[PDB]
Each structure stands twice: as C-alpha cells, then as structure tokens.
Design a binder for this molecule. Structure first.
Ligand SMILES: [Mg+2]
Lengths: 576, 206, 22, 52, 105, 49, 57
DNA sequence: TAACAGCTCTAACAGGAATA
RNA sequence: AUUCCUGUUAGAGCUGUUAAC
DNA sequence: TAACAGCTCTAACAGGAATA
RNA sequence: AUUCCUGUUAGAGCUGUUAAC
C-alpha cells in the first residue's frame, strides 16, 4: 500500500483510529533510545569495576564504544545488538534491585531533557480535537503526556499497570481520550521492561486491547516488533470479528529494514479476513506532519501551539526618529488607493499571450493579468476586438502595499505604471535592462538647463562636468548618466528606489566600457553621490527635497488614470 | 646503482665501519635523485657475512644509522630472503615493508583512541673496555587528529652505567614526548599516557 | 553486607541527597 | 591489557599475526641498538619507517 | 620536497583531478617527517593555470579536502606572492595565515 | 543524500542543530547554550523554524 | 569522586585526586574455559628452625 | 506541470587597490 | 590560490498568479 | 666497597617454520 | 638483514643480608 493512499485512507476515516506508538517515536523527543540506554549502562558499569574517570571519556565516541564493548565481550557477555541484551545489562548493573532500576530509568528518561517536536504535538492535537481516542504506546517517558497537555492546555488521563483496569472502564464509559501505557509509567513500580517481564500481559489491559480492537482501527508507528507479549496480544487482538474495522497499517520508516515478524504478522492478519496493510511513510515526525497538514478545520487555539512557526514571531517594534542621519535613496509613495480598468475575455488568456500582444500591437496603455489595464479603452479595443471582449469595468485597489506584496504581477504592474508616470512629461528617456527600469539623460537634449545641476554634480572641483558622450576607447559605445528606478515593498509601505548608474547605449556591449564605468565611478564618494542623488531627485520630481508632496498621474487624459503621490524627500532618520 | 668495487676489497679486511661508509658512498650517487625513487633496496651478499655481525658492530644497524639522517629509506635484502622455501611468506613481508617505507599505512588499529599516547622505553648494551654502557631510547605510537597514525622513536639523552633514568633525564624525555604529542594534536593534552618499560620504575623515576 | 562496588553504584546513582557522618 | 594486546599487532616489519611485545617496546629496542652503534643520532627524533 | 615531473605532464594534459592527486602523492617525503614541520607551503607554477579553475572542478578545494584528513596544514601560494607590489601585504596576509595554521588564534 | 534546494528539511535541520549543540556541550562540559544564532543566506522555511 | 559527572574545571584542577603511588587494584572474585597453571599453593604460614650463635663473624 | 512576475543566490570570469 | 568585493555574463532556487492535468 | 642470595635483561650464536 | 622468538653460552644492572672501611 502506497503512503499517499494510506493518508487518504486515514484522512477518509481518522475519527475511529487507535494509535500504537512504540519506543521509536521517543527517539526524536531527545530521550535516549534502547541502544543509548544500553550504552549508558555499559559505560556506567565499565567505569566502576575498572576504575576510570567517568567524565574523562564520553560515550558516543567510536573508540570508547569499541573499548567498552571489547571489555564486555571479555567477561563472556553477549556480543553485540542481540536479543536478551538490554534486560541482561539492566539485571547485571542493578543485580535485581527494581527500586534502583526504576530510579535510574526515571533519571535517564526524566521530564527535563524532553523537547516536544511536531510529531508528539500533532498526536496530542489529534487527541484533544477528538479524532483518535485511544493511544497505547509501549513507551515510558511522558513525551505525549506533556505535549498534548501543553498544546490543548487540559490535563491527560494516563493509564498504566499500577491500576491497569482503569482503561477498560474508561473505554466502556467512553471517557476519551485515553492514553494507556502497556508497560506503565516509571513513577510506579510496575514498569514491565526486562525480558522476563515482557513475556506476560496484564489481564485487564490485554482485555482492553481486544475490546478497543472492535471499536476502532489501529495505526501502529515507531514499533519494530521484537516483543512477544505485544505481538501475541495483537494476534489475539487480530483474532476477532471486525478486529480492525478500518484496517491496521503497520507503518515503518523503511519497508526493507522491517523485521520479518511484522511482515509475517501483516500477512497473518490478511489471512484472518482483516484488511491490515503495511506502509512506509518515513519517520514518525514526517508522517504526523503530513497527517496534520491534511487535517481540515483545525482550531486556531490549538494550532497556535501545534506549529509555533506558523504564528509570526519577532514583531519587535521600531522606535521613534528622535534625536548624524543617513539619507537613503527611498522616496515614500503615500498613495494608498488607485483605480484600474478590467476587461472580461470570452476565452481564457495567458499572461504570456498578453505580453506578446503588447509586443505586437504596442499600444499606448498598460495591461497585466490577475486583466487589469491602465489607460484608454480604445487602446484595449485595438489590442482586443469586440468579439473577445465581454465587458469593461473598474477595479479599486484599496491597499496598494498589501496588493503588490501578495501578487508579484501587481508589483510589476504598479512599478511600470509609476515609471511611466514619472517619465511621462519629461525629456529623460526610459529604457529597461533585465527587469530594471532606467531613466537616462537623452543624447540630443544633453544641453538642457534642467540637466545643468546634474552637470554640477559630476563636475570635478566645482567646474562643469559631462553628462553624456562617447567612451574614451570604444568604437561606437555611447554613455550617459542614468538612474535605476524600482519599486520596493517594505512592511506596509511602498518606496521608490533610485540608484545612479552609467547607462551604455548598446545593451549587450556594456562590459566593454566596464573600466570606464569603473573609472567614472572611482571618486563618486559620499559628497559626490549626495550631489548626484539630489540632482536626480530635482530632475525626476521638479522640486527640491524639502517638505514636498509632488503628485504625478499617468495618462491624465485617459478615463482610467492612476494618480500617485511621492514625497520629494528621501528617507532619513536621526541617530538615537 | 652498483656497489663500488673497493667494498669487495674491504670485505677481506674485516672492517665493518669502512664497509658501511663505502656502501654509503656507493649510494651517494642517489643523494641528488631523491625525488625519483622512494625506497632503496641495498643487497648484502653472503660473501660479506664476515662483516655482517661481530663484537661491537652491527652492519645493518650501522648502515641504517648512517642513512637515516639523509632521509631515504632502505629495505636491506640479504641471501636469507632468497634463501628460504615459502615464497608467499617473504613476499608478504617485503611487499608490506616496501609499501610502509614508501609512506603508506598498510593497516591501523581499528577504533584507536586519538587522545591516548603509548610511550615505550627500552635499552641496549655497549660493552665498554672499562665498564658498561646503557643506551636508553623511547618510542611513541600515538594517533594524531588526522586519519593516519604516528610512530616515532628518540634517544633519552651523557653517560649511563645503569638502565634507570634519573629524575632529570626521565622528566626531559617525557617533556619531549609531550611536546611531540602536542605538535600533532594542535596542542591538546594527552588525557592518559601509557609507559612500557622493560625494567621496574625507580622511586625518583615515577 | 554488600560489596563496596554496589555501595558505590547506589551512592553515585543518588548522590544529590545523602548525608555524611564522620 | 587491551592497549598492549592491540599494540602487538601494528608492526609492519613483522609479517606474522602478532609479536611478543607491544610495538613500542620492540621499536624502542631497535632504536636503542641503532643509537648504541652510532652515538651521533641522539639529537634528532626519527620515524618508524626509517628503522623498520 | 620537489613535485614530480609527471605533474607537468598532467597539467599539459589538462586533468585537474590527476594533478591534485599527483600533488598530494608528492607529499610522502614530508609525511615520513610529519612531526618535523607544522605548515607546508605548496607552490603552483603559472604553467598549471589550465587546471587551476574550470567547470565542475577547483584545484584548491580538492587539495584542501585531500590533505585535511592528513592533518597537515597547507598554505597554497600562487605566483601572487611573487608579483604583488604592495609586498608587505604578503608578509601580513601570509604571516597571519601561517601563524593561524601553525598553532592558532 | 542529494538535495535539490538549499532549504534544509525539518529532519536535516534537527540533525544539524543536534550535532551543533552536542559539540557545544562537549566543549562546555555539558552546559546548555543559552543563546543560539543561526545565520542563513536564504530564508528559513516553516520546516527549518 | 573519580566517577562523579559534570564537575567544573576549577574544582578538578584543585583536587585532581592527588597521585596514586602505591597502586593496588582489587582482584575480581573466583569466577567460573578456565586455565590450569603450574603453581601449587603453599599453605604453611610458618615454620620452626634453628639458630647457631658464633663467637666470630 | 507549463508559463509568467519578483527576490535572492551561486557559478565563471575580469580586475584594481582605500578622498584621489 | 596572501587578501578584499566591485561589476559582467548566465542558470537555478524559492515564493506566487493563472491555465490546466 | 667486598662477598653472598634472587629477578631480570641483553650479548652472541643457532635455527626451524605453526596439531604433526 | 622479509620475518617470528625458542633454546644455548655468558656477563651485567638492580635490589637485599653480612663484613667493614
Ligand atoms: Mg625490515
């Protein structure tokens, strides 16, 4: 069974679903696994009999692990990761002292190293929002007792071997959600963890597994078999009418590495008439992340704790401009709402198709798709005939900043509109390179008075500079002053970015003048750049950057006209 | 290269030092071409056995002591290697010896701790005319932070009549060993150091 | 009676709360 | 014990399974012979690949 | 030490991988004396430029990754320390690099 | 093993971050770090956070 | 103390468990392919013998 | 999955030297 | 590659917005 | 410093090849 | 000296216990 079909199968019926989390899931919770516990025990014992400093040598080192394992093999102990080893080393270290064994197992799996990850939190959310009612997990430490309690905010009824008959009563009286530990909490003496204790099953809990088998279907994750009592309970559990109504998928992180007992167990169930399926869904965390993703109408209150990254942190406010102040190149566009034109097409259209129609027709208007057009209707009639046009109406953009941030098409459209507006009534030529718009001093009109201030900006030692011309050592390359103008969405504001550049008349032959572009820009220091930016502000706006609110409209003689207003003074902020 | 002829003549004279120096001068044609070859294969014929071993002199020992400061390995081959019966035994021996002398590492201790240095001190007898001379030298087999592992020996030094290093000499050789270990591991202390001496440690030596 | 090693194991395992009478 | 047992296996000059002594002891003995024969070696330390 | 003359043949062949392998293999004479030195100054003549940098390859990174597990720091020097007019640049960049690679901080 | 995008998956970031603070603990005799700064040239996805 | 964990550097520098000159590591228990040595135990803890006194060294 | 928009990055080259 | 990051020429990666399949 | 006892090791030779 | 360390023949160094100088 493929994983996606299993997800649909679960999503299709997750209301009635027992979970059977093994010790594998707690692997991520940060709790030491079974192998980590075994290695800690060997290291704890090896250092005491052979007097060696405990903290001097670590445990996850390869050399120390090999040395300790060689020592263990020297005394005839089991060789490597073999059965009857974990219980063997426990009973060796603690020499049949179940109180001390319990205390150590509590300390190793204590509730201070546990950091809940997405898997346990998602399962606890499923418990609270009441899709899964029974969670039997052969674990010990309360990764979920903690995690569902933290996200739901309500305490969880954990069941164990100290009572062990609570689960059957709670199941019978429908006191969901129930979280019955088949091997019990470590706070309680019954722990059921050594191999001799792992051959028997508690009568009342075993009874509960069978009664719960009929009511729900089982999903077991992070469980690799190797336990005889749980396997025989499931087999007994499998041996009943509609044992798993929705079927049982034994999920494993890897089908290839799954033990034959499971696959043997899965094949065994199928012969008894149940629809048990073995699937691979990767790790438990990824499985539960996907399951939560497919969950519909998840409450916001619990989802604010399930996925803390979903909520937006670091909303740290900025202080006031009170009390040297950098002067950036950002002109704030205080326009909040604009009007655009919409055309309805009888057939669906593609933004590429509209772009090629722009290239062919070359109208005196702007258009984009989302089809929002800015300009005159007759231009659109030239672009689109009456047959393909259903209606032409109006569009209002109440929040320009949110609109451009949401859709990049709106960003490009508004950038092109403001660029056309700024260069509508001025002699400065408008070009494009890559997707950046450039306002460049024209070659012929370089002697204008409105450029003279710019001529002062580039001048050396206060004399008259040059604005346009030919490269010193180029055959045909022509150069001019220019400004790259862009639209930047910052927070809830829109700004115009101006950057002084040296435009080259041939587009593809810019690199041949690189040295010149370098040479002309070697000494454009803070004062010179300040002067050039002021001159460009004056050219583009017509007013000096003091207390100005110049307003510019694109296509003023058109029915659909956009009227922007940009402060003539660039952004500044005095130091605190 | 060819062994210079006078060596054969000094073979009759029974002068070990002269024979070793003549062999070194024979190999002197290889001093300039150190980059071309990695391992030299000096062969000592059975006819030179008269100077192979005699009181106070060891031919292979003298040859290697003369060639080591020149930094060129030799794998001396006598008639023995071409005198046995099992060819695979000698072939394994020479192949491993040559590969390790070139600069390679045929094998390394699996999961060896890089923070432990295993010192080993031994000694040798020189039968002086008036008394005895005890030559004590140390060796280290530590594993550096890299993947390869090191194995370096050095003298413990002016005159010793007993094989027990005093306070000063032992403190000095162990400080030199500590500096040697520090140089490889960026400067980290050896957490535990193991010392294997052929004789008991004195109270001052500990 | 108990071997000193098991006494050491008990002591290290719970050393945060154990007295010392001299 | 484990350190010495492992050390008796990294003698490249030896073409058999192990030795009687750790390589530290045998190489210290070999260099002791080398130094005893030639007194003008005491200044410098040498690698094992030279005298093996 | 002296690089093998086969390095020149490989460089003429324009094979970066084999050139890096040969440069590393030239280090055995120093590896017999790894305890002797702290930092190795590997020089590359301009004639090897054809293998310095081309697509899907970089000689400097290959050399660094090949000699990193061998624990020996390496200060690669290109003809850049020869020319290099502000020639007290070299003494500080190279000197600070040498001190950092031999010891540290 | 291979990655198609420079945004680490939730398992990869958890593993890398685990290796990082384990290294810090080894260099700090087990003491937990109190401030962690993860600088990335690209934006953190939801999985990374 | 040699098996107490997570101790600050200053404390370990201060104590360092001094130094162990008279090494004495416990022999395990009798235990249970046991090897047979050639040594025969002697349990005669004391014996009686004679002394002669001489007028000259 | 196929285009299209923006934001940002690296991958190869080239390249000159600290307010003149 | 003692360094530095300034540009050029390209491609990807993410987001999106449509059309689907 | 001259014997004596034991423990232990190296110095020179010689010497065969791993359950027969 | 491809190696291994089993024997033989000797001597030295450590400890001790005496005799003293
Ligand atoms: Mg040899």
């Amino acid at each position: 069974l493929t994983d996606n079909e299993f997800y649909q199968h679960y999503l299709q019926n997750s209301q009635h679903m027992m979970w059977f989390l093994g010790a594998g899931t707690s692997r991520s919770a940060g709790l030491p696994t079974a192998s980590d516990i075994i290695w800690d025990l060997k290291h704890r014992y090896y250092c005491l009999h052979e007097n060696q400093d405990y903290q001097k040598h670590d445990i996850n080192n390869h050399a120390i692990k090999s040395k300790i394992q060689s020592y263990m093999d020297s005394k005839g102990f089991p060789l490597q990761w073999s059965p009857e080893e974990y219980s063997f080393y426990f009973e060796l270290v603690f020499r049949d002292d179940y109180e001390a064994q319990r205390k150590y197992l509590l300390e190793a799996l204590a509730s201070r190293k546990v950091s809940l990850n997405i898997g346990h939190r998602v399962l606890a959310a499923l418990l609270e929002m009441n899709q899964t009612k029974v969670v039997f997990t052969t674990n010990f430490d309360d990764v979920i007792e903690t995690a569902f309690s933290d996200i739901s905010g309500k305490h969880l009824s954990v069941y164990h071997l100290e009572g062990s008959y609570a689960a059957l009563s709670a199941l019978n009286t429908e006191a969901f959600p129930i979280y019955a530990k088949i091997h019990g909490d470590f706070r309680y003496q019954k722990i059921k963890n050594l191999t001799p204790d792992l051959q028997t099953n508690d009568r009342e809990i075993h009874k509960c597994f069978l009664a719960a088998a009929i009511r729900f279907g089982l999903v077991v994750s992070g469980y690799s078999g190797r336990d005889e009592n749980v396997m025989t309970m499931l087999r007994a559990a499998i041996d009943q009418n509609n044992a798993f109504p929705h079927g049982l998928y034994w999920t494993v992180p890897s089908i290839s590495k799954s033990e034959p007992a499971v696959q043997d167990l899965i094949t065994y169930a199928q012969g008894k008439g149940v629809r048990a399926y073995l699937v691979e869904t990767g790790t438990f965390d990824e499985m539960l992340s996907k399951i939560w993703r497919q969950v519909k109408d998840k409450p916001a209150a619990i989802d604010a704790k399930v996925r803390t990254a979903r909520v937006c942190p670091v909303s740290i406010p900025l202080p006031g401009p009170g009390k040297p102040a950098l002067r950036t190149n950002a002109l704030p566009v205080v326009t909040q709402s604009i009007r655009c034109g919409v055309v309805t097409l009888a057939s669906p259209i593609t933004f590429s198709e509209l772009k090629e129609r722009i290239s062919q027709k070359s109208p005196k208007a702007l258009l984009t798709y989302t089809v929002l057009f800015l300009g005159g209707e007759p231009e659109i009639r030239k672009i689109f005939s009456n047959d393909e046009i259903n209606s032409i109406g109006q569009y209002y953009i109440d929040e320009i900043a949110q609109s451009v941030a949401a859709s990049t098409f709106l960003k490009s459209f508004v950038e092109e509109a403001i660029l056309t507006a700024l260069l509508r009534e001025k002699p400065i030529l408008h070009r494009v390179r890559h997707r950046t718009h450039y306002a460049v001093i024209p070659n012929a009109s370089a002697k204008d008075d409105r450029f003279l201030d710019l001529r002062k900006a580039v001048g050396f030692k206060g004399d008259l500079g040059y604005i346009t011309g030919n490269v010193t050592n180029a055959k045909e390359l022509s150069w001019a002053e220019a400004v790259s103008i862009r639209l930047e969405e910052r927070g809830g504001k829109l700004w115009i970015m101006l950057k002084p550049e040296i435009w080259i008349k041939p587009l593809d032959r810019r690199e041949e003048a690189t040295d010149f572009i370098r040479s002309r820009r070697r000494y454009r220091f803070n004062q010179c750049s300040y002067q050039i930016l002021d001159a460009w502000i004056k050219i583009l706006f017509g007013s000096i950057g003091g207390g100005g609110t110049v307003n510019i409209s694109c296509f003023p003689d058109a029915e659909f006209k956009a009227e922007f207003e940009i402060g003539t003074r660039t952004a500044f902020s005095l130091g605190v | 290269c060819l062994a210079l002829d006078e060596c054969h003549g000094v073979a009759a004279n029974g002068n070990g030092l002269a024979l070793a120096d003549k062999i070194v001068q024979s190999m002197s044609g290889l001093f300039r071409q150190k980059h071309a070859f990695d391992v030299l294969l000096v062969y000592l014929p059975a006819s030179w056995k008269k100077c192979f071993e005699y009181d106070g002199f060891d031919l292979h020992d003298r040859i290697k002591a003369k060639v080591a400061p020149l930094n060129l390995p030799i794998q001396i081959i006598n008639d023995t290697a071409l005198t046995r019966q099992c060819r695979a035994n000698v072939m394994w021996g020479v192949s491993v010896a040559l590969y390790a002398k070139a600069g390679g590492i045929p094998w390394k201790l699996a999961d060896w701790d890089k923070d432990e240095a295993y010192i080993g001190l031994s000694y040798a007898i020189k039968k002086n005319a008036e008394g005895q001379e005890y030559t004590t030298c140390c060796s280290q087999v530590f594993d550096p932070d890299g993947t390869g592992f090191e194995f370096v020996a050095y003298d413990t030094r002016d005159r010793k009549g007993n094989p027990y290093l005093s306070y000063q000499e032992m403190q000095s050789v162990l400080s030199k060993s500590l500096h040697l270990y520090q140089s490889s591991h960026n400067g980290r202390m050896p957490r535990k150091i193991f010392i294997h001496k052929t004789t008991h440690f004195t109270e001052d030596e500990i | 009676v108990l071997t000193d090693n098991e006494f050491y194991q008990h002591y290290l395992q719970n050393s945060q709360h154990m007295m010392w009478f001299l | 014990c484990s350190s010495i047992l492992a050390l008796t296996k990294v003698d490249w000059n030896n073409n058999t399974l192990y030795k009687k002594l750790p390589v530290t002891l045998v190489y210290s003995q070999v260099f002791a012979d080398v130094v005893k024969q030639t007194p003008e070696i005491v200044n410098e330390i040498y690698d094992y690949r030279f005298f093996m």
